[PDB]
Amino acid sequence: MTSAEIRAAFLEFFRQRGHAVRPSSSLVPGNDPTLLFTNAGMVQFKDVFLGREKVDFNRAATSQRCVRAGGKHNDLENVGYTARHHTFFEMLGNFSFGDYFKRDAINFAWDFLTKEMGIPPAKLWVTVFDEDSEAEAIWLEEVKIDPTRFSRIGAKDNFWAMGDVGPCGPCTEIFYDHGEHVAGGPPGSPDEDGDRYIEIWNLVFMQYERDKDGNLTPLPAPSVDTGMGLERIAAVMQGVHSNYEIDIFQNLVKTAAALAGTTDLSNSSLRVIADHIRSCAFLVADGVLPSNEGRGYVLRRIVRRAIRHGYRLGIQDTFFYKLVAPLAAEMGAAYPELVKAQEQVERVLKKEEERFAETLGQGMKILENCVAKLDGHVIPGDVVFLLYDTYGFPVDLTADFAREHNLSVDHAGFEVEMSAQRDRA
Amino acid sequence: MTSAEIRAAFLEFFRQRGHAVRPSSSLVPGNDPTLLFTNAGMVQFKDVFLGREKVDFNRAATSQRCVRAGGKHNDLENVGYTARHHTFFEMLGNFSFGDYFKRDAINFAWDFLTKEMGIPPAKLWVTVFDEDSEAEAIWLEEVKIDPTRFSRIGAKDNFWAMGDVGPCGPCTEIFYDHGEHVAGGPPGSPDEDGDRYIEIWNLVFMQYERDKDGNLTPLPAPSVDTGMGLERIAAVMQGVHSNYEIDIFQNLVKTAAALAGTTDLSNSSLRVIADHIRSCAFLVADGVLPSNEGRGYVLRRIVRRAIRHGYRLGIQDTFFYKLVAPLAAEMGAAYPELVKAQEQVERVLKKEEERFAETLGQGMKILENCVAKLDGHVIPGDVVFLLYDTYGFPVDLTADFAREHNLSVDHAGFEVEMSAQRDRA
Ligand SMILES: Nc1ncnc2c1ncn2[C@@H]1O[C@H](COP(=O)(O)OP(=O)(O)OP(=O)(O)O)[C@@H](O)[C@H]1O
Ligand SMILES: Nc1ncnc2c1ncn2[C@@H]1O[C@H](COP(=O)(O)OP(=O)(O)OP(=O)(O)O)[C@@H](O)[C@H]1O
C-alpha cells in the first residue's frame, strides 16, 4: 500500500466518522512568534482547543506537514542514525474539540490499525499513563488487547501539557514491533530507544486545566489530539524496517545515488540528503529563505549540512537543487504549492549551495587536517570558531562531521571565542 | 575501615595538602531561600565561588551533611529500593577557590582512592565530559589509567552549571565496580542506573561564566568543587555492596529490628526507617520543626512515612524517637550537636508520631479496604484527598503505600479535589 493511499485512507476513515478534512497549515506558524516551525498537527488548532477561536466543526482530521529541527523536539541529529526520524514528516491527526474523548479516540485508532490497515495485534504494543485508569480499562477490558504487550508509563512520556498554564492530561501510545532482527526493547525497558518498537500513533487527552495560580480543574469539554507519522506506518504497510525504504523516498534516494555515482542505495548520507531536501524544499515553498537569523538560519543550517553530506559522498558539482524535481513529482499531488513554486525553490537552493561552495572545500581541508593532527577526541574551539566565522560552517555542521569520526567539538570553547569576537566587533 | 576512620582519613589527606578543614554547614541553608535543605558541600561556599564573600583560605575540605528529599533529583523515593540512595548522607568534599584546577583535583582523588585507601584501579571506572580534552589527557596520559575503564559522557551528566547565570564547567566522576554479583552496566550504557557501577566521587570544574544573555567567557580564577558519598566509599572499604550494610547502618537496622521484634535484617522497611531517622533527627537538631509548610512539611512527610513503615512492620507502640539514641552514639563524636540536642530531638519526634497515631490506624483501614476492592491499578483521587485532608496522610505517603501493592495514585484527581475544596471556601 503506497504512502499516498495510506494518507488518503486515514483522512477518509475519519471523514466517514464525521471529521472535517482540513488542509495542512504552513510550516511557518501564523499565530506564534515563539515557535520555529509547525511541529505537530495541533499547532493550527491551538486557539480552537483553548476556546479562543470558534469554528463550525467540532472534529477534524489533517495530514500536517511538520519540521522538527528546533526546540526540545529536535530530531535533526537523529536523521541518518535511526530508522524512524526525519526533519520533515507528515503527521496524520484526528482532533476532538470538546466532542468525543478517550473511548472513541482509542477505538478509532485501533479500528484503523487493525481493521482498515489489517495490522496483526500481535505486532502492536500499547502504553498508557500509569495513573490513567480510564484508558487502561478501555484498552484492557473493552478493546481487550493482549495485556502482556502493554506498558504503564510515568508522566515524562505519557502526560502532556500545553504549557505551564492551560490544558493538560494523559496520553496513550501505539507502537509497532519490527521483530527480533531489529535491536531494542519495548516501551519502558532500558532499551526502549532502539528502532525495534517504533512509536506509530500518539493520542493526547486534554482532560484538565491549570490556571495562573496553579489550580488544577477538570476541562469543561474534554478534547483529543492525535498524531501518527505517515512514514512510519508506511514502512509498516510496505514491509520495511526503515522509513527511508518506503515508496515516497525511493525516487529521492535513487536520484541522489546517481548524482553521487554510487550503487549503495542504503547509504546513510544519501538518506540524510533525501530527508533534507524534503524539509528544505517545503520550507522554501512556504516562504522561508536562507539567512543568519531565526527561521532562515535553520533552513541555512539544514541546506549546508546536506551539501556537506554530498561532499562526503564525493559529489563535485552543484547537486542539491536537482532533487526538487523528483520530490515535486512524488508529492505534488498532495502538495500542489510545491509544484507551483518548484522553479523558485530550485533557484533558492542552487544559490545557497553555490554560496556555501565558496568556502566548503577549504573548510573541509582545514577540518581534515585538524583530524589528522589531533591528539584527543575533541575538535578545539578555535578551529570550530574559525570554520564558523571565516568559512560559514554552522557549529552543528562541524559537530556532524566530527561525530562521523567518533569525535566531538568543544562547544564551550567555541562560545568563548564568540564572546571574544563580540568584544572585537 | 570504619566510616569514622574514612571521614577522618579524607579530611587529614586534604589537610596535609594545605586544605583548611572546615565544619559542615547546617542542613538549613542560610544564604539561599529557594533551596529546601543543604544538598551538597558546595552550598555554604557558593558565595566564595561567586566572589561575593572573601575568606582567609583558598582551599578547603568538609564532610558535609546533606538531605536530598526535594527539588532536583530528590532521592526519597529511592530509599529502600537501591543499595546507594539516602535522604541524609555525608558528602566528603575538597574545594579550590581560584587556586588549583583539573590536574591537582584529579591526582588528589586518584591518590586518595588508590594509594591512601588502597582501592585497586581495576575496580574503578572514570567518566569525563566528552568535550573535555584537558580532563581526558590528564587521566589517560598523565595519571595513565586503564583507558578501557573510561567513558566519555554528554552534557546531561558531565557538564555542570551553578544556575542559568554564573559559573559552569565540565565534571569528571569516579565509579566503583561492585562486580558480576550486582546487576547493572558501566556509566554510559543503557543499564548504567543499576547498583553495580556506583558513583563514588564527582569532581566539578568551574571553568566558564555564563551571563544573563547566554554568553560564555572564561572564569578569571577557575575553581574546583568535589563531592564523595561517605556511605558509598564506606561500603567499598568494608567489603559490602549496599550502603545499608556499613557499620553505621548495621547498628541502626539492628535497633529497628529489635523495635519490630524481627531477626530479618534484610527487610526493606527496616532500611527505610534507619535512613529516615538520620534525616529526621539531624533536621530537628538543626532546628527544623514539623509543620504544614515548607521545610517543616518535608520533615513531617519523612517522619510520617517512617511511622507508616513501622505500621507495616507491625510495631504497636510509639517507636521512631527511640532510634535517636543509637544514632547519637554512632555519629555524636563527629556531630556533637546531635548529642547536645538528643532529648529535644526525641521529644519532637515522639510528639509528631503521637500526633499522627491519632489517624494512622483509621487511614490505614481505609487504604487497605480501598486496595481490597479496587478495580484497576490507580487509587482514586478522592480517596487520596480524604486520606490527606481528614487523616493527615501526605500524598507521597499514600503513593509509597500504593507502590508496595503494585498500585499508583491519581495525582491529577487529587489536585482536582484540592481545587474543589478551595471553591467550597
Ligand atoms: N522526527 C520525526 N520523524 C518521523 N516521525 C515522527 C517524528 N516525530 C514524530 N513522529 C511521528 O509523529 C507521531 C506524533 O508525534 P508526537 O511528538 O506528538 O508524539 P510523541 O513523539 O509521543 O511526543 P513526545 O516525544 O513529545 O512525547 C509520533 O508517534 C511519530 O509516529
Ligand atoms: N541520595 C544520595 N545518597 C547517598 N549518596 C549520595 C546521594 N546523592 C549523592 N551522593 C553521593 O555524593 C556524591 C556527590 O553528589 P553530587 O550531587 O555532587 O553529584 P551527582 O549526584 O553526580 O550529581 P547529579 O545530580 O548530576 O547526578 C555522589 O557521587 C554520591 O557519592
Author numbering:
A (entry chain B), B (entry chain A): 1 to 425
Q: What's in the article?
A:
The N-terminal fragment of AlaRS corresponding to residues 1–429 was used for successful crystallization. Their structures are referred to as AlaRS429 for the wild type and AlaRS429L219M for the L219M mutant. According to the superposed structures of AlaRS429 and AlaRS429L219M, the side chains of Leu219 and Met219 are situated in a hole formed by Pro167, Met206, Glu209, Pro220, Ala221, Pro222, and Ser223 (in motif 3). The only structural difference in the hole between AlaRS429 and AlaRS429L219M is the rotamer change of Glu209, which is since methionine has a linear side chain, but leucine has a branched side chain. However, there is no difference in the position of Val204 observed in the crystal structures of both AlaRS429 and AlaRS429L219M. Leu219 in AlaRS429 and Met219 in AlaRS429L219M contact with the C-terminal segment (residues 206–209) of the β7 strand harboring Val204, and thus the amino acid identity at position 219 could affect the dynamic motion of Val204. Interestingly, the B-values of Cα atoms of Val204 in AlaRS429 and AlaRS429L219M are 19.96 and 26.68 Å2, respectively, suggesting that Val204 is more flexible in AlaRS429L219M than in AlaRS429. That is, the more dynamic Val204 of AlaRS429L219M invades the space intended for the extra hydroxyl group of Ser, whereas the relatively static Val204 in AlaRS429 allows the binding of Ser without inducing clash with the hydroxyl group. Unlike the previous study determining the structures of the post-activation states, our structural studies about both AlaRS429 and AlaRS429L219M in complex with Ala and ATP depicted, for the first time, a visualization of the spatial arrangement of both substrates prior to the activation reaction.
Aminoacyl-tRNA synthetases (AARSs) play a crucial role in the translation of genetic information by attaching specific amino acids to their corresponding transfer RNA (tRNA) molecules. Alanyl-tRNA synthetase (AlaRS) often misactivates Gly or Ser instead of its cognate amino acid, Ala. To get structural explanation why the L219M mutation prevents AlaRS from misactivating Ser to produce seryl-adenylate, we determined the crystal structures of both the wild-type and L219M mutant AlaRS proteins in complex with ATP and Ala. AlaRS429 and AlaRS429L219M consist of the N-terminal nine-stranded β-sheet structure harboring the catalytic site (residues 1–241) and the C-terminal α-helix bundle (residues 242–429) responsible for tRNA recognition.
